Amino acid sequence: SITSDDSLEVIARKLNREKELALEQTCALLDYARLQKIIEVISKAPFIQITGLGGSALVGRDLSFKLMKIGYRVACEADTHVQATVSQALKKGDVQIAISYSGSKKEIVLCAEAARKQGATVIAITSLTDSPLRRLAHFTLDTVSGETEWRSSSMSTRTAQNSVTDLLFVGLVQLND
C-alpha cells in the first residue's frame, strides 16, 4: 500500500487510512455478548498477567498502568525470562491477557501454555488467523491490521490492539455500579 512513490502527505494520509480500517474492522468483529463475559472474568481476577513482546508489550503495559490505577493486581514484564517465570507460577482463577498479532511467537505461546497448565484463564488479543495462541485461549479478541507489512508494521496493528484494550478498560470502569 505505502510505496516509495508516495509524497509525505500521501504517506500521512495512507497511515491514517490503515489505522481507520484497523479500528473499524476490529470493531466490526466484536461479539458484544462475549466482550461482556470477558470483562466479568477480568473483573474477578485476583491477579492479572499481561504478556507481549516489543511494541505490543507497550500496549500491554499501557493497559497494566490503567488497571493498577484502579486497584487490580497486575504483572506485566518485559524480560522474557521473568515473564515466563511469572506464567509458570500463575494459579487457578488468575487471568492472563496475551497481546500478540501473529499468535505464533514462541515466548508468548509458551507463557499461555504455562498459564493453562497452572489452570489460569487465558484471553488472547490476536489476529484472525488460527494460531497456537488462539487454540490456547479461553476467549479471543480479534484484531484486524491495516498495514503494509514492510513499511507500517507496528502501527495500525498497535492501533487495533490499543482499541481493544481501551474498550476493555472503559467497560471495566463502567462496572462501578
Added chain:
Amino acid sequence: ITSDDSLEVIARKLNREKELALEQTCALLDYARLQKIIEVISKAPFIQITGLGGSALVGRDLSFKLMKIGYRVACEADTHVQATVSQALKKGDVQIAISYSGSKKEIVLCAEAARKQGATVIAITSLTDSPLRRLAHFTLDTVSSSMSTRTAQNSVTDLLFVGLVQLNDVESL
C-alpha cells in the same frame, strides 16, 4: 461519551474520538517543515526521546523502530535517568520531546538542558502556547481522551518514522 451506554456505543464513540485526533492532527501538518525535521533526525548522531506517563510509552514505541534500523537512541521511563541523558547531550544531537501539555516540569527541564547542551529540540505537543513550544527548534502539533492523545502522538511518530525510511531509502539508491 457517558455510562448507561452499551459496550457497542462505547466502542464506536472511542473509535470516532481517535478518528478525530488522527485527522485534526494531520490537518495541521506543514510538509515542508516536516521534511526539514526528518532531515535533522536523519543526520543526528544521537537521538533522545523524552516523555512521561503515556507519552513515555509513545516514545519507547518509536525508539524501538529507530533502534531496529541502527539509529542511536535513548528513551527511558525513569524520570531522573532521562534527566542525566539530556544534560549529557552534545551539540548536533537531537531530542524529541513528547508531551501534550508542554508545561510538565520534567519535559521542560530536559528540553532546557538539551538546548543548554546545544542539541536540536523537536517538540510533539498541543497547540497550547507552552514553555516547551518556546524552547523547541521545531514543533509538530498534536490535536486530541488520554487515549485520543496517545493516538495523536503516535500518528506523528509513525509518520516521522516512515518518512525517515523513505528519505534514507532514496539516498542509499
Added chain:
Amino acid sequence: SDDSLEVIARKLNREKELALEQTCALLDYARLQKIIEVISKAPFIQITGLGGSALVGRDLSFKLMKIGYRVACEADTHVQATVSQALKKGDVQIAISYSGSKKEIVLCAEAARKQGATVIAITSLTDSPLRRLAHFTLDTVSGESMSTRTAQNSVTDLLFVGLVQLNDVES
C-alpha cells in the same frame, strides 16, 4: 583516587566486605523469623525503592515471583505510588531505602499503613521517617554507594532464603 586499578579493586572489595559484616552483625534472628512469617502469609507484596535500591527490589522480586508470590515492584515512581494506594489489610510492603527519608518511599509507606498493610523497612540505623513508619525494620550499614547495594542485597537474599526454607520446612 590516583591509585592502581588493583588498589581500586581491593578497596571496593573491602568496603563491600565491611558492609556485609556490619549489616550481618545487627541481625536479630528472632525478629527475622517473625518477618519471614509475615511476608509468607501476604496475599500480595509490594517492594518499593528508588534508583539503585529499586534494582535491588526487583532482584528480590524476580526470585519471589518464581516461587509463586504475587509481587509488584515498579521502578517508575508514579506507578509505584498508585500501587501503594491499592494495598489491602494483610498485604505487605517491603521498602528499601538507605536514607529512610526520601519523600516517595515515605509516601508509599504511609499509604501502605493507611491502607492497613504491613510495612517492612530495609534501611540505615538513623532515626528516620521510614523507620518510624515500619512495623518491622531490618538494618543496613554501609562500608564507606556500591557497598550500600551490597548491604541491601544481603538482607534481601536472606529473606529469600528464609522464605524458601519456610515452605520446605512445612512440606
Added chain:
Amino acid sequence: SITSDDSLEVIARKLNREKELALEQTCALLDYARLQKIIEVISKAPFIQITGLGGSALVGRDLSFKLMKIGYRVACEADTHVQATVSQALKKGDVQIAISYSGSKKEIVLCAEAARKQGATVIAITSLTDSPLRRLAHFTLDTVSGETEWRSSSMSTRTAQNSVTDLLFVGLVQLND
C-alpha cells in the same frame, strides 16, 4: 532442600562468606594489563549495548545508568526481542558487554553472534567454563564463585558480576576525570 543448613544465622554467615570469596577470587583472576585495554576499548566506543537476562540484566542496567550519567551512549533493554534487534543493528567499533554467568543462554549467545556478525567488539563478563559466549568474545572478564554450597547461585553470581561492573565504572571515571 535449598540449603543443607537448619539455622538462619548459619545460612546468613555462609551466604556472606560465599559472597566474600566470590569477590576475592574474581578479583584475583584479573589480568590488570588486559583490564586497562578493556577499559580503553569501552572508552572509545561510540555506542555500547549491555546484554543480559533476569538478574544479570539488572546488573547491566545498574552499569548502564552509571555510564549514561558520565555521558556514554548506552543501550540496555529488558525486552529480549528489542535487545535482539539492537544486537542485529550494531556496527563496527561498537562494543557489546554481554553479562551471563553460564555463557550458554540462548538469547545472550545469539546477541553476541549478531554483534560479531556485524563487526562489533564483544566483551563477556562470564564464568571460566568453555562456553559459546566465551568462544565468541574478543575480551573476557571472569566471574567465579566461592567455595561454599552457595556457589553459582544467582546471589553469588550477581555479587561477582557487580564487582566487575563496579570496577569498570571506577576505572572509567578515572580516565574521564
